Amino acid sequence: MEPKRIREGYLVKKGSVFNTWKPMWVVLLEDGIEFYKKKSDNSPKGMIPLKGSTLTSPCQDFGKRMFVFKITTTKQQDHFFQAAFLEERDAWVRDINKAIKCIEGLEHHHHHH
Fold first, then answer.
1. Which of 22, 30, 53, 56 could form a Cys-Cys staple with 70, CB 3.0–4.6 A?
2. Is the domain covering 1-113 a CATH 2.30.29.30 domain?
């Protein structure tokens, strides 16, 4: 009903506290991926620009355990987060990287004339 995001779920993201790794709620939207702690902590912990982010798969030595990839928002903001399994690892990183690669071609204001 109210909830209207492209791909929302709950994965652990490392970026907000003192360098750690804890599960969290995150919703990638077609205009930006904003994630909080629960389906709606009511206050987002950090957002991701849907244009200028990178993807690292595999990732670096930051976990490299189950399925943890590393993204780099145009603001040099690394994002090492792991899903619950491979299917959710490529489905989450592909949905966030897809929306970011889709906004680069989804602009408005046409100047045909």
1. 56
2. yes
